[PDB]
Design a protein around this ligand. Structure first.
Ligand SMILES: *C(=O)CCCCCCCCCCCCC
Lengths: 459, 128, 177, 99, 87, 155, 65, 79, 122
């Protein structure tokens, strides 16, 4: 994995030794070249994972997340070069360096064969995200959003480290390749109960879980566009990856332990969809939809069946792409009308036809229209949770209706009806914005042709 | 004689059947007078700010910003924990969670108990 | 009691609106023209019987009982004109009513396809921007203390000037764009 | 009540301006000044070429793989003759006629 | 479909509908003839005239605009403004 | 915008009530805030709770799509009472009579369906007779187990 | 060329559509009459219905005692 | 563009049920001033509409003739 | 249709039920009854791909009709005579079923008369 870390670190001498106004072009070009070279991680075998050295290894689970991250960085640079045109050159270089550092920590998180190294990078992703949210946001509440985002996550992750250190004093090693062969059954006791809680609550917090999700509507709607992309599409998958790595050591105590969290997520999807039915803000609507989808992924991981794991990783990739597209749509509308109210700018189909087409396509992929990978993941999770119990399908099925009750609603209030009369600064769609939405959507529509590369490490 | 209309929550009383509309007292006429005055002043301000040729942007409505701020950021400072709010929160937060936990635990226990004795039909169920 | 120019509905307007609604619902009740004409003459007799009633509270009670009578026997699905609100064709063409200011955002390559129209548009914009301050000074010197009382706008009382706030009403999109 | 004279004058002037604006919406005969720039084509480029393409695809790439195109067997009636090996299916038993 | 309407056509149609009314004798009315004073009509007759024009032209006139229409020239101008004639 | 135009706590003194009524651009006598039961509403007014379909459609509204003016105070549930959503128009028939009629109709036809299921209708024929022991081999039966001989006789 | 609209009189008709409408109505009635003449069994009844009470006792195997 | 209108004087209610309405009102005691406006629907080419049974039997004559001709033709060819 | 009124509004102990027939033995009252004969062979019925409900006691007429329909393409109205033969055969089968129903009803009535006579003598 040294062939991907070194160009990412060399991106900083590229962005600091560049010209007065050539930073965006050079960074976008070289990050797109890194994204092109990222496809060499598809050397996967049916039995063996790809092991590079004693520190870095790549299974079939970390590979789609790595490709998504290195694909997301140029899109991020394209998205965050319109509201920073008035910024200082040094501050612009600092923002680009923050994005590069965050991407470096993200691609070093997924390949870590040691759980301590994985945890270290998993908390090292906090500092650039917090700095971006608290510095380059727009509202006042970002300062409050800098606290709820931080002290939630550490409150889940500081006990967990202790539990990880306990494994270092118990099994003798924390290497994931070793622990696949030296694993032991976990007997039912209060000590193993609290060790399960310590090892899981960090990933329930960072996913998030219903009840612990309070930081996500606050850290999504004050953050800038790049921060919204990094929270929605990547940083919510660290919890899922950590769950999938750590569920191996927590057997067979998980069978009777996962019940309250399964009930919490199965009711939280309905609660967050109902909240989406009455939200007055576009950004908060997208945040609560993200909460609902990640609660679904939590259920899929907790029931731990192969179909559930496949649906979980497919849902993770599909939700990341769809939420990134929806956040970029919301950012374009916010840049055009200078407000976040849903009811303010109506009837935009009569003014922007192509943006209306992009809105319709994104809302189509949000409610999991087949044969998109959203439907693939959600369908497989539904099959697995029907195998788990025969009643949960009801708690799935009703949720589906509410999804189709808000996404199209998020379309209609923003696209259809009579246009407002007192708004006359509606510019035509720029080429950069349309390029951004096409680069967001065309991989998502192309992945329906060959979904076997995003179906987890047990395909 | 004729069946009188019963007002409902989702079926309001007709405007032409309202007895209070037919009052021709002085106070109702005065109230309509300053209601029309307030509406006319607001409309005049809006259409003066709206027909400006130099303006190219959004005519900001303080009512919309007021409503959006009251809906989201002004809920907790106006909240006091009392009997009604605690009862509603206990009924709506942990009620359905307990109900669904009991339902799913009972169903899973029955299914597992059927599985151990071999009564459950699993002749072809090999994908899980 | 919601009017653009007035603050209330008088007795005469209430009687006239009740008569119009009753005649429309009666036309909806009987399909054919001759039966509708017969019963419309009957209703005209019923309204003309109590025309010269100088007792005001008796007129009010007659209005209340006539409104109850109309509410008792109105059609469940009355006839609605297609362009009337609640009709089949109501607000259908609002998806084609593009506002005029979008023409300000057109590219110069596609602005050269209609030269004379855009020349006339530039003349219209010059007229509006040269009459705006005159009409806003007319408005600010005619509105009484404490704001306007009604929503009625004053006309153009001078020679050469335009009525105030004339742009968005004159340049509205047509009903069939 | 009828038309108040002040708003009657306003309506008259507004109508005159609206009529002038509607008159200005017409086009000159020059506008729009545009920038300067086989009977069986549909039976060939829309039927014959896709038929060739997918007949090649079915003959040499679908039927190559096993169990892709599976067909219901043809119906065999008494009195018929098999083309594959020439066997004749014997006719049925003599009917106990009723009419 | 939907043939265009001119001011001459609208004035001819409103004069036709008013001429087919038995309360108005055809030899006295003019296009600028008031209903209440020049012709001696009634408010109910004004409502009947308004709904007759509504049924003739196939579109509904609101009551707040119907109460201020009292002369055929006003009706012609109102229908002309609503239908956007003379373009 | 400024600080003393945003909503605040529940008004208690009449001067605070008058200031809140002036802030919300209506009369003091028509300014009725939500009751201070601790539900979080604050000083937001309690509008008469009717849908936007009941508004005048012929009025020159500032927002004719939603039938709302500029600067007028919005309902707390304005996103519920839009024309795309729940309507509270006055029905020609009372609500209780409609509900009772619909429930009686559904219940009566369900009861009569159950009664007709109890007593079905048919035609005066016997069971259909199929050859070869009721087609034992054709019903997927195993050829090793010889079926019980079922013989049908001519009538 | 086209049909000019008329005011409160009968509309101008085309001979071709009148001929086509009469031809299609005549074809419908001819088809109905022809099928009723030839088939005639799908309406009135394909087969006679015997009376169940008319069957004799000895052909039903009723033992007389 | 120029639509000429027919004469207003021909629209009389004679031969129409509007005179039946007029007789009923005159027996009761009132007037019907709008008969001449609606007189155009009951006179001219819109008068004497067919009944329902005559509507269902549209084109029955030619169809019966064609059926008789075809039956005779098939009787000739069957011999 | 009168049998529904005789069974529901009358007495159900005499009217036979369609769910289970016959209750009387087939050799009771019938001296040396004869069984129905199958003409179509099981193999011929098998390779003709007949529907299982279509495999009644005279499916040979159906086989002949299907062969004629297949061999007279595209004249779809050529040989309706085979269809008429098949319809006549299934009508005869329905007549046989009606005869069986009437036999069961008459035997049930006879049994009721027998027990009524036993009640009379005792
Ligand atoms: C014998 O009377 C029973 C017939 C079948 C059950 C009743 C069917 C009723 C509907 C069909 C006949 C309608 C006659 C007008």
């Amino acid at each position: 994995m040294l062939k991907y870390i070194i160009p990412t670190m060399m991106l900083m001498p590229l962005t600091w030794l560049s010209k007065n106004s050539m930073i965006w072009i050079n960074t976008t070009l070289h990050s797109l070249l890194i994204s092109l070279t990222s496809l060499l991680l598809l050397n996967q075998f049916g039995d063996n994972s790809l092991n590079f050295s004693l520190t870095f290894f790549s299974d079939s689970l970390s590979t789609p997340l790595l490709i998504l991250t290195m694909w997301l960085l140029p899109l991020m640079l394209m998205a965050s070069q319109h509201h920073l045109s008035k910024e200082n050159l040094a501050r612009k270089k600092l923002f680009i360096s923050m994005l590069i550092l965050l991407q470096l920590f993200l691609i070093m998180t997924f390949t870590a064969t040691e759980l301590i190294f994985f945890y270290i990078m998993f908390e090292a992703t906090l500092v650039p995200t917090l700095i971006i949210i608290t510095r380059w946001g727009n509202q006042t509440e970002r300062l409050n959003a800098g606290l709820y985002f931080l002290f939630y996550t550490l409150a889940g992750s500081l006990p967990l480290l202790v539990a990880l250190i306990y494994i270092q004093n118990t099994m003798g090693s924390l290497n994931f390749l070793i622990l696949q062969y030296w694993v032991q059954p976990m007997p039912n006791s209060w000590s193993n109960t609290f060790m399960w809680l310590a090892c899981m609550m960090a990933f329930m917090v960072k996913m998030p879980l219903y009840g612990l999700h309070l930081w996500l509507p606050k850290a999504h709607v004050e953050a800038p566009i790049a921060g919204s992309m990094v929270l929605a599409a990547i940083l919510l998958k660290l919890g899922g990856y950590g769950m999938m790595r750590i569920t191996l050591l927590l057997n067979p105590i998980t069978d009777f332990m996962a019940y309250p969290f399964i009930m919490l997520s199965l009711w939280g999807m309905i609660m967050t969809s109902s909240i989406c039915l009455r939200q007055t803000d576009l950004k908060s609507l997208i945040a609560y939809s993200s909460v609902s989808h990640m609660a679904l992924v939590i259920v899929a991981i907790l029931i731990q069946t192969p179909w559930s794991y496949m649906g979980a990783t497919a849902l993770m990739i599909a939700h990341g792409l769809t939420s990134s597209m929806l956040f970029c749509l919301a950012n374009s509308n916010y840049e055009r009308v200078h407000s976040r109210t849903m009811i303010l700018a109506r009837g935009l189909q009569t003014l922007l036809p192509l943006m209306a087409a992009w809105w319709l396509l994104a809302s189509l992929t949000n409610l999991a229209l087949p044969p998109s990978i959203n439907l693939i993941g959600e369908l497989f999770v539904v099959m697995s949770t029907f195998s788990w119990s025969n009643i949960t399908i009801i708690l799935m099925g009703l949720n589906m209706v509410i999804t189709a009750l808000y996404s199209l609603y998020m379309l209609i209030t923003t696209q259809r009806g009579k246009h407002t009369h007192h708004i006359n600064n509606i510019l035509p769609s720029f080429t950069r914005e349309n390029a951004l939405m096409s680069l967001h959507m065309l991989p998502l529509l192309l992945l329906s042709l060959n979904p076997k590369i995003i179906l987890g490490p047990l395909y | 004689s004729f069946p009188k209309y019963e007002p409902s929550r989702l079926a309001s009383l007709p405007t032409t059947l309202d007895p209070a509309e037919y009052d021709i007292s002085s106070e109702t006429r005065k109230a309509q007078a300053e209601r029309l005055a307030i509406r006319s002043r607001l409309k005049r301000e809006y259409q003066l700010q709206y027909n400006d040729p130099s303006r190219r942007g959004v005519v900001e409505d303080p009512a919309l910003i007021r409503w959006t701020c009251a809906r989201s950021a002004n809920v907790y400072p106006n909240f006091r924990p009392n009997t009604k709010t605690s009862l509603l929160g206990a009924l709506f937060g942990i009620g359905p969670l307990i109900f669904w936990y009991y339902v799913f635990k009972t169903d899973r226990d029955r299914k597992e108990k059927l599985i151990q004795e071999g009564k459950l039909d699993r002749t072809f169920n090999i994908s899980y | 009691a919601f009017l653009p120019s007035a603050a209330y509905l008088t007795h005469q307007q209430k009687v006239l609106q009740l008569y119009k609604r009753a005649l429309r619902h009666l036309e909806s009740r009987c399909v054919h023209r001759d039966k509708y004409r017969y019963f419309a003459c009957l209703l005209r007799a019923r309204f003309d019987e109590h025309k010269n009633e100088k007792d005001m509270v008796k007129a009010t009670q007659l209005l209340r009982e006539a409104e109850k009578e109309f509410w008792h026997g109105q059609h469940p699905q009355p006839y609605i004109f297609p362009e009337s609100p609640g009709g089949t064709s109501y607000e259908r063409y609002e998806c084609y009513k593009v506002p005029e200011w979008c023409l300000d955002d057109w590219h110069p390559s596609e602005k050269a396809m209609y030269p004379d129209y855009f020349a006339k548009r530039e003349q219209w914009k010059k007229l509006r921007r040269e009459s705006w301050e005159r009409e806003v000074k007319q408005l600010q010197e005619e509105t009484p203390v404490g704001g306007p009382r009604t929503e009625a706008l004053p006309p153009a009382r001078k020679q050469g000037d335009l009525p105030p706030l004339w742009w968005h009403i004159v340049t509205r999109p047509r009903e069939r764009p | 009540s009828g038309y108040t004279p002040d708003e009657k004058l306003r309506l008259q002037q507004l109508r005159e301006l609206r009529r002038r604006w509607l008159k200005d919406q017409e086009l000159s005969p020059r506008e729009p000044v545009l920038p300067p720039r086989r009977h069986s084509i549909f039976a060939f480029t829309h039927v014959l070429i896709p038929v060739w393409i997918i007949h090649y695809y079915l003959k040499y790439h679908v039927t190559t793989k096993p169990y892709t195109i599976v067909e219901k067997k043809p119906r065999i009636f008494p009195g018929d003759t098999i083309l594959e090996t020439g066997e004749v299916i014997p006719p049925m038993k003599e009917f106990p006629d009723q009419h | 479909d939907a043939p265009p309407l001119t001011l001459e056509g609208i004035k001819d149609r409103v004069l036709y509908v008013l001429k087919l009314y038995d309360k108005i004798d055809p030899e006295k009315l003019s296009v600028n003839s008031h209903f209440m004073k020049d012709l001696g009509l009634d408010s109910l007759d004004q409502v009947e005239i308004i709904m007759a024009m509504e049924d003739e032209f196939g579109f509904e006139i609101p009551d707040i605009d119907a109460e201020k229409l009292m002369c055929p020239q006003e009706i012609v101008d109102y229908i002309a403004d609503k239908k956007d004639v003379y373009e | 915008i400024t600080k003393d135009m945003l909503p605040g706590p529940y008004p208690k003194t009449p001067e605070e009530r008058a200031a809140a009524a002036k802030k919300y651009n209506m009369r003091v006598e028509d300014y009725e805030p939500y009751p201070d039961d601790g539900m979080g509403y604050g000083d937001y007014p309690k509008l008469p709770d009717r849908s936007q379909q009941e508004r005048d459609p012929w009025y020159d509204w500032d927002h004719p799509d939603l039938r709302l003016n500029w600067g007028e105070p919005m309902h707390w549930d304005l996103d519920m009472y839009i024309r795309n959503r729940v309507d509270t128009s006055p029905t020609p028939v009372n609500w209780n009579l409609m509900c009772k009629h619909l429930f009686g109709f559904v219940a009566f036809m369900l009861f009569m369906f159950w009664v007709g299921e109890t007593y079905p209708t048919y035609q005066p024929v016997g069971p259909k007779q199929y050859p070869y022991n009721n087609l034992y081999l054709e019903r997927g039966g195993d050829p090793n187990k010889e079926p019980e001989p079922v013989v049908h006789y001519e009538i | 060329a086209h049909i000019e609209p008329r005011y409160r009189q009968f509309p101008q008709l085309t001979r071709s559509q009148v001929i086509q409408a009469e031809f299609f109505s005549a074809t419908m009635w001819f088809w109905i009459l022809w099928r009723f003449w030839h088939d005639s069994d799908a309406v009135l009844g394909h087969f006679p219905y015997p009376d169940p009470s008319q069957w004799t006792d000895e052909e039903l195997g009723i033992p007389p005692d | 563009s120029k639509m000429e209108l027919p004469d207003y004087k021909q629209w009389k209610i004679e031969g129409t049920p509007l005179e039946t309405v007029q007789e009923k009102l005159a027996a009761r005691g009132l007037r019907d001033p709008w008969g001449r406006n609606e007189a155009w629907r009951y006179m001219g080419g819109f008068a004497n509409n067919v009944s329902f049974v005559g509507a269902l039997l549209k084109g029955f004559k030619w169809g019966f003739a064609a059926f008789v001709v075809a039956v005779g033709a098939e009787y000739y060819l069957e011999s | 249709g009168a049998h529904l009124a005789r069974r529901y509004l009358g007495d159900a102990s005499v009217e036979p039920e369609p769910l289970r027939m016959p209750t009387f033995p087939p050799d009771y009252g019938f001296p040396e009854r004869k069984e129905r004969e199958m003409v179509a062979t099981q193999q011929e019925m098998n390779d003709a791909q007949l529907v299982l409900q279509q495999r009644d006691y005279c499916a040979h007429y159906l086989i002949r009709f299907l062969k004629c329909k297949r061999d007279s393409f595209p004249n779809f109205l050529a040989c309706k005579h085979e269809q008429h033969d098949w319809d006549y055969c299934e009508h005869l089968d329905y007549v046989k079923r009606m005869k069986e129903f009437e036999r069961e009803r008459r035997l049930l009535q006879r049994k009721k008369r027998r027990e009524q006579r036993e009640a009379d003598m005792a």
